[PDB]
Design a protein around this ligand. Structure first.
Ligand code: HEM
Ligand code: HEM
Ligand SMILES: Cc1cc(N)nc(CCc2cc(CC[C@H]3CCN3C)cc(F)c2F)c1
Ligand SMILES: Cc1cc(N)nc(CCc2cc(CC[C@H]3CCN3C)cc(F)c2F)c1
Ligand SMILES: C[C@H](O)[C@H](O)[C@H]1CNc2nc(N)[nH]c(=O)c2N1
Ligand SMILES: C[C@H](O)[C@H](O)[C@H]1CNc2nc(N)[nH]c(=O)c2N1
Ligand SMILES: [Cl-]
Ligand SMILES: [Cl-]
Ligand SMILES: [Gd]
Ligand SMILES: [Gd]
Ligand SMILES: [Zn+2]
Lengths: 402, 401
């Protein structure tokens, strides 16, 4: 009645008992599995809040204490008087860490307890929101010694619109639809680029132009804010032994900072709560640079390497991709900017799974996102069966505000 | 009807074929178990009725005289005897369908070209061995490999089953040690000790071809030495790394799966070995580089003078690409059919487009379709897939012992 899970490299078997507590429902049925798809009232607020309060008082060894029951009654009474409730500062910190811990697609969760939580729930305007965001970027970047962080802006509440960051990440390169239909820059960012221009941004014409932030205060149009260039640390890409690689003029930014996800804690929703960590090298080298629908550099690099691109069996794509990933790792290490390779990251994720089996009886994990996009079966997570399910607190997708 | 998106091109399709999914799978709204290798009497007539309907739809003759006639016959056969017999053409159709329905098979663009050997009159283990031998010779074909399946007698109540105890027709010995380790293939330590147990004189090499354990109903298995010239093997060499040949690596030509159960129209065939040709990553990445298999990756990296002291040199990735190159070069030089993972996945994308217009979708298991190296460099990575069970099917079954 609890899923049995095998690791095929060692022979291990565990049972994921935590999955039986899964609090919301996913896309799969006994009919059909949809695991590979990218996108899968006071009483119900109270029951969500009650579960989270139970989690919080369990974590501090105060389950069933005087303070525990008091907090339950306080929330009950605030939901009856106001239709909502406010988290205490310690509850917010706990909830943000649990949301990361619970994120099935994150291979970086060995780190979940080391998260700096900035409380911006008093934020008042898009201009104050910008200042909070700049300081998050400065703290998290830390001159290349990256530190995980999240900034939480005010929750959704009755009577008011949302705070929203329109950008999908705090640092993103412009994607300029050009008139053939090609894109100069990042094709993933064509939409937000057009929105920025529409709100008064004077565009560039380079491949690596950092976009401005579009920031929305409750019941206000979004407002455009240019990031100070010295806050955006970037890494020019070179290769340790292919000297022509630097002449590609490729770059990437230090800080991966997701800004468009919804943070849900105890039934409360925080539509603006950007979080950042540090990159895994395959995110940059394999996906961002080599996806055919992104920068798509693979064939240019292969031609430069003198590989035989006329036949698939020469494995020219694999050879070129390896050297691009080498170039990313080398360049970030040379620049003294935190980066993790996919072998170290998946090894640390295996330790996380062992930690979590002891702590909670399992760990929600999405195999297709945990296994790296190159060298899959060379990493230990390939051979680990995984159980995917939804726990709260959680980071959730939400529709684009436009 | 699940909506399914390809993220490289941005196109959308709907898998309407999923709505007819039969034997339910392991996932629930509460938890997805898509990554698990093994998913967690008048009913015979329902499965035969549906399969006969499948048959006459495919030949554009549903609701015609031969269709109604065949419906009554299976009814009368089951009423009289409790089971029924497939016509030769239906057995051919069902074998091709079970391959077409195999969600984990990336090679399904070939599903229309399958040679079916009808062995339902087999009656002894010596008979099996001659059948298996005929299959291997036909399928190998001096290196110009041809997909094939041999269908041994169906399961029936009261009697025992035909079983092949080997997981494949060609396997290498796995010899345990004075200290746990293994000379040879660790995937086959269990069946190596069974062959030795039934009288097989073991060897001392890393690539000794195991004998066959063939089991006629209610008889203990019997060893059969495979004729050495029937087992086509490929010594592994690298096109430029001259020392690679000195590693003494070899693999065999024919991937022939001999432990799966073939289910057609409610009938069960526990002995129905099928074969095709290898995708290069199966040999170079999984069989040779998996930690619990031959685990050669670090030895190749030492010969390449790579820095094995830091994971961020990507020495594993570099060594693995060169192993896969050596596999492709060696099989092409030996004139033995093989397909690289780029070609195979591009053909699978074509297969998805064909199946979209033919049947309204295609059951596909993303984790098994995406190759074990260079995943996001292939188009299947960016293709959302829906996994579900149709019949006819190849199913897993308990090991016979
Ligand atoms: C500290 C280093 C971190 C590493 C190395 C890391 C690694 C990754 C990777 C490789 C992905 C896959 C995303 C993709 O392929 O586009 C991912 C997803 C994710 N990460 Fe982490 N991450 C880190 C920190 C964090 C932090 C600090 C948070 C939140 C506090 C977080 C939350 C998430 C979430 C919610 C996802 C899901 C993204 C989605 O569903 O699209 N991660 N992570
Ligand atoms: C002709 C070329 C073929 C290619 C290139 C090919 C390729 C593959 C690959 C790479 C797998 C992954 C399984 C694993 O790695 O464990 C697979 C699975 C499978 N193949 Fe094919 N195959 C071919 C022919 C066939 C034929 C002729 C049949 C049956 C008539 C077949 C039936 C299956 C089945 C049932 C599986 C599922 C394996 C499992 O779930 O363990 N294949 N195939
Ligand atoms: C904090 C952090 C550190 C590291 N290393 N990587 C990441 C992943 C980047 C990341 C990327 C995406 C894009 C996914 C699909 C869904 C919408 N988009 C088209 C969606 C995320 F939610 C996310 F988080 C985050
Ligand atoms: C005909 C054909 C051609 C090619 N190229 N590849 C194959 C796949 C080989 C193949 C391999 C396995 C091992 C999988 C795990 C599950 C049990 N075992 C430990 C299980 C199969 F069922 C199978 F078929 C077949
Ligand atoms: C269609 C498929 O689900 C999609 O490409 C997924 C697969 N696995 C992934 N894994 C990670 N880490 N990131 C991704 O964007 C994706 N994309
Ligand atoms: C744990 C995981 O599901 C398991 O290792 C699967 C993953 N995908 C696979 N894909 C193929 N083609 N063959 C395999 O054996 C596996 N193994
Ligand atoms: Cl990114
Ligand atoms: Cl194999
Ligand atoms: Gd050089
Ligand atoms: Gd040397
Ligand atoms: Zn599922």
């Amino acid at each position: 009645k609890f899923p049995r899970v095998k690791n095929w490299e060692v022979g291990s078997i565990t049972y994921d008992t935590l999955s039986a507590q899964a609090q919301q429902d996913g896309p799969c049925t006994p009919r059909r599995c949809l695991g590979s798809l990218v996108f899968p009232a006071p009483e119900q607020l109270l029951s969500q809040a009650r579960d989270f309060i139970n989690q919080y008082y369990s974590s501090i060894k105060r389950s069933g204490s005087q303070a525990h029951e008091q907090r339950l009654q306080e929330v009950e009474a605030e939901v009856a008087a106001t239709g909502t409730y406010q988290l205490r500062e310690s509850e917010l910190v706990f909830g943000a860490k649990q949301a990361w811990r619970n994120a099935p697609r994150c291979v970086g969760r060995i780190q979940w307890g080391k998260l700096q939580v900035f409380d911006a729930r008093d934020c008042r305007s898009a201009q104050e929101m910008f200042t909070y965001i700049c300081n998050h970027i400065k703290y998290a970047t830390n001159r290349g010694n990256l530190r995980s962080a999240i900034t939480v802006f005010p929750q959704r509440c009755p009577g008011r619109g949302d705070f929203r960051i329109w950008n999908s990440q705090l640092v993103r390169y412009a994607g300029y639809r050009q008139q053939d239909g090609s894109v100069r820059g990042d094709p993933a960012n064509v939409e937000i680029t057009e929105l920025c221009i529409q709100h008064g941004w004077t565009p560039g014409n380079g491949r690596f132009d950092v976009l401005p932030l579009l920031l929305q205060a409750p019941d206000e149009p979004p407002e455009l804010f240019l990031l100070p260039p010295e806050l955006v640390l970037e890494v020019p890409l070179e290769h340790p032994t292919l000297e022509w690689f630097a002449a590609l003029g490729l770059r990437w930014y230090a800080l991966p900072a997701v800004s468009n996800m919804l943070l849900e804690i105890g039934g409360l929703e925080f539509p603006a709560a950007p979080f950042s960590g540090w990159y895994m090298s395959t995110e940059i080298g394999t996906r961002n640079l080599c996806d055919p629908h992104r920068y798509n550099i693979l064939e240019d690099v292969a031609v430069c390497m003198d590989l035989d691109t006329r036949t698939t069996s020469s494995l020219w794509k694999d050879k070129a991709a390896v050297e691009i990933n080498v170039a990313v790792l080398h360049s970030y290490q040379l620049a003294k900017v935190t980066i993790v390779d996919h072998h170290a990251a998946t090894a640390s994720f295996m330790k996380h799974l062992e930690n979590e089996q002891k702590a909670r009886g399992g760990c929600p994990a999405d195999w297709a996102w945990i296994v790296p996009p190159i060298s899959g079966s060379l990493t230990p997570v390939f051979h680990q069966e995984m159980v995917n399910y939804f726990l709260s607190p959680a980071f959730r997708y939400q529709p684009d505000p436009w």
